[PDB]
Enzyme design. Structure first.
Site, short mmCIF file in Angstrom:
data_model
loop_
_atom_site.label_atom_id
_atom_site.label_comp_id
_atom_site.label_asym_id
_atom_site.label_seq_id
_atom_site.Cartn_x
_atom_site.Cartn_y
_atom_site.Cartn_z
N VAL A 35 7.39 3.67 3.22
CA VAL A 35 7.80 4.55 4.29
C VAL A 35 9.26 4.91 4.09
O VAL A 35 10.10 4.05 3.89
CB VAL A 35 7.62 3.87 5.65
CG1 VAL A 35 7.94 4.83 6.76
CG2 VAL A 35 6.20 3.33 5.77
N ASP A 86 -5.96 -3.96 13.78
CA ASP A 86 -4.82 -4.62 13.16
C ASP A 86 -3.60 -4.74 14.08
O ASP A 86 -2.54 -4.18 13.80
CB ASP A 86 -4.48 -3.84 11.88
CG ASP A 86 -3.48 -4.55 10.99
OD1 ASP A 86 -3.57 -5.79 10.83
OD2 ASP A 86 -2.62 -3.86 10.41
N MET A 112 0.84 -1.20 0.00
CA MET A 112 0.00 0.00 0.00
C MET A 112 0.87 1.25 0.00
O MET A 112 0.64 2.17 -0.77
CB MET A 112 -0.94 0.03 1.22
CG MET A 112 -1.79 1.30 1.33
SD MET A 112 -2.96 1.33 2.73
CE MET A 112 -4.37 2.40 2.01
N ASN A 144 3.29 -4.66 13.72
CA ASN A 144 2.87 -3.29 13.98
C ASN A 144 3.29 -2.76 15.33
O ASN A 144 2.84 -1.70 15.75
CB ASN A 144 1.36 -3.15 13.81
CG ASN A 144 0.95 -3.22 12.36
OD1 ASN A 144 1.68 -2.77 11.47
ND2 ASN A 144 -0.23 -3.77 12.11
N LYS A 148 -0.69 -6.82 15.26
CA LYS A 148 0.15 -7.98 14.94
C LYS A 148 1.62 -7.67 15.22
O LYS A 148 2.00 -6.52 15.34
CB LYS A 148 -0.04 -8.40 13.49
CG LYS A 148 0.01 -7.28 12.46
CD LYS A 148 -0.34 -7.87 11.10
CE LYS A 148 -0.56 -6.80 10.04
NZ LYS A 148 -1.21 -7.39 8.83
N1 LIG Z 1 7.63 5.75 12.26
C1 LIG Z 1 8.25 4.83 11.69
N2 LIG Z 1 9.60 4.71 11.88
C2 LIG Z 1 10.40 3.74 11.31
N3 LIG Z 1 9.94 2.80 10.50
C3 LIG Z 1 8.59 2.91 10.29
C4 LIG Z 1 7.71 3.84 10.82
N4 LIG Z 1 6.43 3.60 10.36
C5 LIG Z 1 6.58 2.53 9.58
N5 LIG Z 1 7.86 2.08 9.50
C6 LIG Z 1 8.46 0.96 8.74
O1 LIG Z 1 7.69 0.70 7.66
C7 LIG Z 1 7.25 -0.66 7.66
C8 LIG Z 1 5.87 -0.63 7.03
O2 LIG Z 1 4.97 0.05 7.98
P1 LIG Z 1 3.37 0.03 7.79
O3 LIG Z 1 2.81 1.44 8.22
O4 LIG Z 1 2.62 -1.06 8.55
O5 LIG Z 1 3.26 -0.25 6.27
P2 LIG Z 1 2.01 -0.37 5.36
O6 LIG Z 1 2.23 0.36 4.11
O7 LIG Z 1 0.70 -0.11 6.16
O8 LIG Z 1 2.05 -1.96 5.12
P3 LIG Z 1 0.91 -3.00 5.57
O9 LIG Z 1 -0.45 -2.68 4.94
O10 LIG Z 1 0.86 -2.83 7.17
S1 LIG Z 1 1.37 -4.92 5.16
C9 LIG Z 1 7.24 -1.01 9.12
O11 LIG Z 1 6.91 -2.41 9.43
C10 LIG Z 1 8.56 -0.32 9.49
O12 LIG Z 1 9.75 -1.03 9.11
MG LIG Z 2 -1.69 -0.08 6.99
MG LIG Z 3 3.94 -3.75 8.49
#
Ligand SMILES: Nc1ncnc2c1ncn2[C@@H]1O[C@H](COP(=O)(O)OP(=O)(O)OP(O)(O)=S)[C@@H](O)[C@H]1O
Ligand SMILES: [Mg+2]
Ligand SMILES: [Mg+2]
Length: 269
Positions: A23, A136, A20, A141, A138
């Site tokens: 980051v 969510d 999606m 997260n 897990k």
């Molecule tokens: N504030 C943050 N600081 C450092 N790494 C971060 C931070 N937020 C996210 N990440 C990194 O980014 C990865 C993806 O974060 P998510 O926000 O869960 O991604 P996503 O795009 O929602 O993917 P899904 O839908 O959860 S599988 C994490 O598991 C971390 O390695």
């Molecule tokens: Mg998400």
């Molecule tokens: Mg993730």
């Protein structure tokens, strides 16, 4: 992906790219500080009501303010050829998700473990009293700061009042509330302890089915150094019946702080 969003947030490394968003570790040029910016998957999923889910996720986490919950500092979108690019500016957590720690270290020390999840509880209990439900929760997260601090971070599927970690109730479109998260944390508490979820399945449905049809093999029977007093906590939170498990996340924490010291779990069997 302009390595300079809105001409203010200088993009740098890539902390992660899901299905999606992507980051990135960025630099706030005005405040001279490092920030973590989340970008809606470069338009590949930005035209649909997916932008809503993103805008409403930034604001659903912006509503909370607690150490264990990653804070949102700013939102917006920069203009690029295909159109808008919604981004989110969060606090940067130089760390690791629990999914990782449980992959390169195996299980956590019961006490180390108890410690983490207890902190995670503190974050969810807060999130709850503020009318937010993290549908969510897990191992991926929850992050562990480089100084061993806990951070809960994904709200993309959270609504304000991969099912290895979902609750029977949330399995179907049933009742999803506080206790659902409570049940989820129970899985996390379980994996961080054994090295695996209460239930493994080759296909999703076999897993869902197991969550609402089979008792979670006691932690002790699944892994070594496990206090059957810790079993009392884990299996409680994993009780199929919402009513029969901890009603609030603080109530679960209370029974974790107990075990952490040396006290008896106010949990049954
Ligand atoms: N504030 C943050 N600081 C450092 N790494 C971060 C931070 N937020 C996210 N990440 C990194 O980014 C990865 C993806 O974060 P998510 O926000 O869960 O991604 P996503 O795009 O929602 O993917 P899904 O839908 O959860 S599988 C994490 O598991 C971390 O390695
Ligand atoms: Mg998400
Ligand atoms: Mg993730």
């Amino acid at each position: 992906t302009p390595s300079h969003l809105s001409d203010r947030y200088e993009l740098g490394e890539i902390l992660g790219f899901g299905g999606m968003s992507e980051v990135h570790l960025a630099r706030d040029l005005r405040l001279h500080r490092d920030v973590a910016v989340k970008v809606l998957r470069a338009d590949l999923a930005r035209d649909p009501s997916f932008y809503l889910r993103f805008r409403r996720e930034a604001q659903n986490a912006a509503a909370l303010n607690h150490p264990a919950i990653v804070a949102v500092y700013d939102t917006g979108e920069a203009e690029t050829p295909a159109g808008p690019l919604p981004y989110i500016v969060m606090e940067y957590v130089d760390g690791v998700t629990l999914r990782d720690i449980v992959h390169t270290e195996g299980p956590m020390t019961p006490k180390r473990a108890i410690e983490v999840i207890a902190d995670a509880c503190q974050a969810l209990n807060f999130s709850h009293q503020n009318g937010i439900i993290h549908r969510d929760v897990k191992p991926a997260n929850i992050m562990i700061s480089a100084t061993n601090a806990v951070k809960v971070m994904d709200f993309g599927i959270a609504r304000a009042i991969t099912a290895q970690y979902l609750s029977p109730e949330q399995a179907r479109g049933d009742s999803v509330d506080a206790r659902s998260d409570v049940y989820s944390l129970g899985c996390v508490l379980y994996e961080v302890l054994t090295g695996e979820p209460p239930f493994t399945g080759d296909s999703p449905v076999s897993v869902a089915y197991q969550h609402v049809r089979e008792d979670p093999i006691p932690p002790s029977a699944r892994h070594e150094g496990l206090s059957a007093d810790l079993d009392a906590v884990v299996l409680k939170a994993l009780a199929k019946n919402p009513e029969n498990r901890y009603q609030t996340a603080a109530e679960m924490r209370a029974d974790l702080v107990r075990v952490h010291n040396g006290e008896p779990p106010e949990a049954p069997k």
